Structure formats: C-alpha cells, structure tokens
C-alpha cells in the first residue's frame, strides 16, 4: 500500500497548510522555541525543528527604508552638471587627466573635450597616494586652475576632495565633489559632502561590499543632499593581469536598489589602456549612466597612471571606436 | 649659472645615450653587477646602482610561444559544433540545465531551445557538489539522455566529464566535453582531454589566475587537442551581493592573448536571475564568443541551483530581450 | 491569543513529525531525489491554498519541511557529519608507523619540495633520521602551472622514496594526483597526499576513501572551511576515516607571501572535526624567513604537525629553489623548535 | 669583447653618477616635479638615437634613470623609509604611562568595543586594574558601516574614558576620526587610534603625525604590507615617530570569520620596520571561541602586545555584541594566558 502512504502525506501536507495559516492570521520572542523542543519526541533533532519553525516564523512578516533606495522613492534621481542630466538614459563621458600638473596640460585636454561636443572634464588637485614621497596634488592651486579651465572651455569639473574642511573650499571652484575609494568610509568627510547643495561623484572602496557602498551614500543622503552619483571602479582581488577587477554586475545591482546613477571609471578598475575600449562597451551595454576615463597630453611624464592613460591621439581612436560602436545616441 | 647647469646635463643625456647603445651594440651573467658596485663611489645606492644596471641589461632584448598564445599562431581558432562556427564572429548561445534530472525535463528545454531556432544544449551528468550528500548527477545515464535528446532535436550537446577515465567513454555521447571549474587545475583531466579529438569548453577555477587558465590551457593543446573553448564563469571574492564576481575583462585579456574562443556563463558567475540579461548584454558588446546560461522547466524542485535558473516562461522573455537589444544578428 | 498559538505550534510539531515518520516508512517500502514526486505535492499544496500566504511564501515553507525530511535518510548525513565532533566526539589518532598524529603530541614532517635522485632525498631522510624523527615528505608526481615545467619523476620517484624510507625508517607522505593511481600508491607511500589544486577533484577522493590508508587532505587554494569539511566527508563517507587536514593558507590580494597562512583554521576545524590538522609552512608564506614564526604559531595555536621543505642543494631544485631549506638551515630551525618549549 | 663590455660599465656608472651630482646641485641652486623639463629631456635624447633600440626602449631607460635621481633628495625617503630598519635599524620602544611597547615584553590592551557610560566602561576598568594591567580601549566615535547605527558619545565618550583612566590608573586608547579633532584628543587620550576604514585617510594620518602623542595605526581592511608601511610613513614624515602597527585580519571569501587574521604580517613588519607591532584578535576572528587561541599564536610569533574586547554585559552592548567577553570570561582567558608561559 505504497500509493496508501503517499495519500496520507498528500493528506498530512494539506492538515499542514491548514494549520500554519490558521496560526498565521491568529499571529497577528523565543518563548515558543523552548516549549516547542520540549515537546519533541523525534524523528527530528531540536537543532533541525528549531530551524524549522524559524523559517514559519519568518513567513509571518513600512517606511524603515534608507533614503536611498527604490523603496523610499521609486523615481530615478537625475544629477545635472553643466546642462547634461546624469542618470536620464544617455550616457555621460567624463575624461580628463588623473593628476593636475599645469593650466597648459588641463587645457590641452579641455580642448580635446569641447572638439568633441563633451562637457565634462576630471582632474584630481588632491591625490591620495600609497606613498608620501608621490606627488600629492597642487592643493587649492589646481581647483583654481579646474575653475579657470572651466570658465574658458564652458565645462563642468569633477575633482577629488580628501578632508571634510575643504569641502565648503571646493564649492567656490568645482562642480561635482568626488570622494575616492580609499575614503568610502571616511565617515566625517561623507557627512560633509552631505550638508552641501552640490553633486557628490562616491567611488566605491577598494574593497567595498554593495552593502556598505549603499552605507557610504546613505550617510551623504540622511544630511540632506540627494544629489549623489555612485562610481564603479573595481574591486581588489588576487588577479596580477588587471589592477583591479572591474565589478560590472554592480551596475544593474545599485541600479535596481537604489534611484541613484551610477558610472564605470575604466582607467582605475583595469589600469590598463588595452582594456578601456572593451570595458567601456560594456559598461554602455549594461546601461551604465556614464563612463570615466583619463587623459593625458604626455602621459610618459605624467606625475601618476603614466601608463593607463590615453594621449590626444589615442583619445581620438577611442572616441571614434565609441561612436562607430551604435552603442551611444552622439 | 643654472642654464650652463642643463647644459652639461643634456650633454651627459646624450653621452649616456651614445655608450648604452655602443655598449648594446658589442652585447650581441651577474659578474658585471660584482664589478660595477665594488666601484660605485656614490651618490646612489649600491641596491639603486644594481637596479638601474639590471634596467639597462633587461633592455639588450624565437619560438617558445605557448601553443595556445597568439605569439604562435595569429589566426582566431574555430571551433565548430553541430554547424556553429564558434569564434568566427557571431556570438553563440548554450542554454540547458544545470543537471539532467531526467529526459522528459530535458526534452522540454531541448523543445524551448529548437523553437528559437538555436543548436546547442547543455546540461550536467556528473556534478561536482561540495558535499557527497548532495545529488551527484546520473552519470553515465545521463549521458545517453543527453544523446537521445541530441538525435531527436538535433542539438550539440556540452556536458561536463570529472575525471580522464571518463574522457573516452564521453565521445559517443557528448559534441562537446566540458573541464569545471573545480577540476581547471586537475591536470591529469586535462592530458586526457588533451589526446582525443573533440571539442573541449574549460572553464575557469573559483580562483584561478588569467595564467593559469592560460596553462591550462596548454596542457590540453600540448598533447595536441587544439579545439578548445575558454569560459569565464566568475571569481571568487569577498562579495556577498553575488554569488562570484563575473570578471569580465578576462573577455578582452583571453581574446588578446590567446587564439582561442571565449565564452561567458552568466549563470555560475553572478548566481542571480535578475543579472542574467544585463550581464549577456555586456558580454555580448566586450564581444564574446558565446553566453551561456541555465534553463529548466520547474526550476524550484531542481536538484542544483534551483534559484539561479530561468523557467521556459522567463526563457522566452530573456531571448526577446536579447533579440531586441540589437546586439546579435540572430 | 498566546495560549491558543501555543496549542498550534504544539499540533504542527506532532503533524511535521507524523509526516516526517510516513515518509522515511515509504523510503523502506521502496534514487533519493524525487523531483515529480515534490512537483506533485506542490501542485496540490498550492491549488488547496485560501491565503493568507501567497503561493510563493508557501511553496517556501513547505520546500523547508521537504528539505527537512533528507536528513532522515540512514545514508544522509548533512546535519551530523561523518567527520565533525556531532558524529565522533572523541578525537581521531591516525597513526603512521608507530607515531600517532592528533593525540596532543605535534609531529614534523620534513622534506623536498620534489625527488630529484636518490642521493638526494637520502641526504635530506638523513638529517632527519638524525633528529631523531619519523616522517618524510617528497614529491613524485608534481602539480604544475605550466605543462613545461617539472612534472615528477612518476612511478619511479615513488620508488626512490621507498628505498630511502625502507632504509631510514621514516613513513612516506606523497602526493597522488588521479583516482587509478591510487591502488598502486598503496605498496609505496604511508600516507596518500591530496594536492590543494585537487581538494575537488571529487572522483579522486572517493578513490582514496575506498582504501585503508592515512589521507593527507590539503584545503583548496581558495577553498572555504565548509569545503574542505565537505571534501573531507567525501573521502570517510567511502569508509576510509583515516584523514588529517592540512591548512597551506589561501589566495589572496597579498603579493608579500605567495598564501596567506589562515592560522584561525586550526582552532576552527579542531572544535568543528575529530580530524588531526597540520599546518604547511612553505607552502603559504612562501618565504624562508617565515618558517620559524609560522612554525612557532601554528604550535602553539595547537596544531597537531608541521611540514616544511628541506633540500640538500635548494639552488639546483627543479621546484621552490628559493623557499626550500638547505641541511644547514634545517639545522638551525629544529633547534629553535626544540628551543621554544612548544613541543 | 667582455673586456671592452666590462670598460664601458664603469664609464656608465661614472657617468650616470656625475650626472646625479650634476642634477641634485641644481635643486639646491633653485616643486620637486617637474614634467615640462623631463619632456625637454627626452625629445633631445630622442632626437639624438640613432638604434639600435628604438625610441619607447630608450625613453623607458631615461626615465628609470631620471626616476632614481629622486631618491638623492634629502626630503625624499623612498629607498630608506623613516619607518624601516634601513633608516634605524634598533627597535622603537613607544611608552605609554610608563609602560614600554615594543621592547620584548608583550602589552595586553582591553576594554569595550563602545563607550557607553561611566559604570560600563569604569568595571571594565576594575577588572584590568585587578590583573595588574595598563591600558584601557574604547570607542568614543565609531566608524559604522550604517548613519543608522550608533556612532559614539563623542566627546562626552572621550570625557568618560579620561574620568575612568585617571581614578584607575589606566593609559586610554582611543579612536579619533577626523584631522579637527586630534588636537582635543590630546588632552583626553594617551594613545590616539586610527580605525582601519581611515588607513589611508591621508589627512588624517598627516595630523596625526604633527603632534607628540603615541599613534596606533590599524591596518585597512584589504591594504598590502607596503600600503600599511606607506600610510605609518605619512605619520613619521611629519615628526612623529611614537607609532605602534596593529594587525586586526584581512578581508577575503572566507565567511566563518569576520576577517582572516593575517599572522604572518607580524613578521613581516617587525623585521622591515622597527616600529612594535600588535595584534587585535577580536576584530580579526570575530568570534569568542578563537580569541584565546589567536592571542596565543600571536604571542608566540612574536607580537608586542594582543588587543581585545570586554564588556560586563555583552547582550546589551551598542556594537560587537557576540565578540566581546563579558567578566568571568575575561578571567578565564586572562588565566590562561599567564598558564601558557608565552607571557
Ligand atoms: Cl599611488
Ligand atoms: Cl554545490
Ligand atoms: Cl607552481
Ligand atoms: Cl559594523
Ligand atoms: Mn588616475
Ligand atoms: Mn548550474
Ligand atoms: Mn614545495
Ligand atoms: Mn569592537
């Protein structure tokens, strides 16, 4: 009677269903763990009957949402710079060197920018470097030579800021406040960046999870400002071929939990000018909202990323490689 | 007189230049190194000096290219399967489930993928699980599935072989052997794959370097199987958001470095059904040779990777959106 | 309301157990997976389901309660694993001929990364010999990055360590790569060695859980603990228990060690397992100058042995020239282990 | 020809050495940067090639040589770090009330993961007082993942900790996150703690170094060696040299930790800096079971002093509650510490 027993379970099954929703609409902490193991007289160990009602427990489940989330507001946050909406559904580019050297130097690059019909331009006046001896930026000087850039080329300027007091500082000389990776959880400095009215570029951390890169924003977010565009950059791993391993999955994963745009920066994820092409075509396909790369009038002189850096020429290459790819709407 | 002072640099820059490349020129191992320091009187280092003089000897530079590297042969290599030139240019798609569970569910896949019109299925006989309690696969069994549904649908069929004295056993049932990822580094597997004359689909180990995939590689092509298609399936790291982190710069790095195919596993590498689509989008534009991904008709009570596998419903969705995204011929 | 939901609870324990009862009956009156036969259950589950929950939440639940029902199985051992202290509480002693290993006392297991001749690995049983230990290591058959480089002299480096160890008294610890190679190993090494880069090569664990031989089990190059338990079960689920766990660190971003020494694995698998586990410290650091200090934590971080590389002339070895430790150093070393009251 | 090969190596050394002179008299004779005059330098040397290497062979030469020059200044300390052996090659001994770290006897530092209230932090105080310890941690401002989750007392914390440390006699280590608030800090802490998420918080750490007060540097949460070497030597660039490094685990797959403790770090930096080096083996493990056992492979590897969390009442804490011992457990681990004759 093999086909008896299976009715029984089928029958059991049902008794179950019965039971577990009739409780459910009545429930409606580890009080009833304790008596329930009390009451086990086998087949199954307390660890495993534990674990059981556990999960039916759960089942049996607001405005708790972090401000950042789709959950607290379900419409795409669109971040304009300079006239051009970041986050609408056509991508930015944003090049420029890694370091400011020189007003010469930017202005070469700015110009290569404004041929092209783009209106943004990065450039770094405060380096964070693994050594102190490495060139750690003009300061206050290089914003001032960005403001000045962007007065005559009429484009907007994206720059690092590395302590909270310069934030209120850079205000008066760029457009978009960028905090790198290695200060994601630089707390104090993120609540800084919060109290401003200006757009925030957030790198994600050299190895940062989803989970705290969603954090870093929301301590942006809670101090008022909204304007927060997120930044794919790599993440670190074992691999010695790459600097870093781009984490592309992470674009359609912050997309869907939160309303934020969010960038691939080519040039720091691989570090390695071979790849930017390729790894741009993929950050547009998976519907990145931009994408940032260097450029260099000289990068064999270059005081960083000498090698990861396009010059005008290989700029142009890649520019036209970008166009001819149907991937972008210029 | 701090010109004068340029001026004698610039000279001693040319003479420089005059005796590395009269110097070069006669040199065409670390007795120089011991004579060069014993009259090293300042201002560098003796560790400086020796650095600078290995730069110097390193630039004073065949046919011991890896069979596999593009140093050997220039050409992309072809792998044809079932009449599908893989490598040739346009994007291949292998969809299937992740384990054979018996031929009505495969069969029903095997209807899903002939009514789009492709030529390719996967699907596990043998699974290598991280525990013995877990289900192992059908083994030879499913194998002789995997080949009736290949007669009757008139589908090439990639299914994984875990150890070499299965290798031959596989060439009457399978068109294309597949190497896991847990046994990338099983060398003997790979000499076995190496001598029989069927295509072969290696995937990448959880933490495998871009040079071991390489090498191993090479193990297989060294015993004279040149038919081989690479596969990036993910990394291990220590995000949680995923359930690896799909490294797709190897795309770009492999195509480069190698004359081999390679194709993307969409499914393995980010664990999630929601990064399905975007991750072969971006595939497909960094210009792999293939997607791969997993398809089951009742994926909640599969044997392995229930959550992570498109139902026949989802399937068709996923296709629709592959050919409407205008990145693939088909 | 409490009073009425603890009477509940009460009823679904007695159901879920009745269940769980009828089932495992049904396992007696007849493969263990049943994929249709959950389909069919589901199918009636969700067309009788009136809310509150949606189908979804209840295909959930009762997928748990299926789940569940596994562990029942005579040869389902998830939940009290063959190889953890919830099976065997006392701690497992494998012992190599005459020295137990786990019993509290560390052991040393010394030797070439690679046999290279016989001259060579009996200079190195030699020193040992001298110190009055019972152990060699060497390898035959050699894992390689590259198929150009060394790959072991085979069956032959097989037998050259069996004469050395025949001679000097020593055991036998080597490496076997593939499952047929197995049975022939047996009449030259005392313990079977299962490389990192094979910690999943599944058939070749159940091959080595077929025979009645000390297993060497090395953890994965980037294997998690949960793995490497699994790996182990692989091996004991065949009937061979006889296994010791080698930590031999992981992969990492680090470029200043080749591995990084996961030293908090020891106390991890000792209160988790019975198995004895040893610490390599070659092998993780990479480094020569680290050997001593990680030799040093790894002892008193209660590991049951330590392995490390000795070669006669590590200048000329076909494997880990820089790594290995030459006669001299090997000296030094062991009197420094001698020296920290850790053994 | 080696004859005439071996002439033209000395003429190159006197050369490139001349050249050295030549250049460094010219940053006396005047930023250290400066790519318009190494352009300037290169086109003439470009100009000028005539094979048999091609230009980018030659440039890449010039520029290592022009990147060594660097190094011949005096405010440049790339190939001899402040930090390292090579610059002083006897250990820093950094002390702390009286209390020498780093000079061969370990230090053991304990207190709450929080500041929370002045009975909290003041029996905990009790409890290391009665061992016949030193030092006392606890979090003021604390680094959350989450805005949501507590952040500290603040000052007020810091008030607490300084109010408990004076009636205990205890040293306070504490964590101060932003550049403003090392100059309060001063009056408050005697050792100011930079958090592992601020390794490389570059403004932070130059405030740090501009001030007399003892620095413990915890190491990022996936930083290198050199990286950890290069963030001390922000701070020792500036002045300050009473640095102590702390080894608190690396982030990596592994999920039955928090962190991988990364023993082998200890040393690594012990023999390439001479700064003292301590070990936090709360914040490695992340569990309460491997405390002992890592403070113990620490203490034999050679660390200058162990880290860890106590808290008289764990289940209410505000941060680490399943970390951190509460009393009893306190005396037993400090029990067994004295056993194990590391101390
Ligand atoms: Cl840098
Ligand atoms: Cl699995
Ligand atoms: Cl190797
Ligand atoms: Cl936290
Ligand atoms: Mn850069
Ligand atoms: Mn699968
Ligand atoms: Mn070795
Ligand atoms: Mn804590």
Redesign the interface.
Known sequence: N?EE??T???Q??????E?????????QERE?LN??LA???????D???Q???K??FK?GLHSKALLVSRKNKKEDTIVTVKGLPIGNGEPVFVFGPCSV??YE?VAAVAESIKAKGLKLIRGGAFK??????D?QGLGLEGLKILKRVSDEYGLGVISEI????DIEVALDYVDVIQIGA??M?????L?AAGRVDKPILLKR???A????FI?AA??IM?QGNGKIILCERG????????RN?????A???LK?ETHLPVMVDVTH??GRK??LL??A???????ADGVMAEVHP?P????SDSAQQMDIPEFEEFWNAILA???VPH
Chains 1, 2 share one sequence.
């Open positions: 093999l027993l299976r029984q379970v089928d059991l099954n049902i008794d179950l269903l039971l577990i929703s009739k409780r459910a609409n009545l429930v009833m008596t329930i009451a086990n007289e086998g087949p199954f160990e660890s495993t009957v674990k059981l009602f999960e039916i089942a050297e020189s130097q964070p470097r693994t050594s102190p001896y060139f590395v302590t909270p007091a290695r200060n959880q630089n707390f104090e400095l609540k951390g050299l190895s999870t989803i989970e705290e954090g929301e301590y809670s993440i670190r791993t074992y691999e010695k071929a790459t391993t781009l984490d592309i999955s674009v359609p994963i869907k994820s691989t071979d790849l390729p790894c075509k993929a950050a547009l396909a998976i519907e000289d064999a002189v270059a005081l790819s149907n991937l």
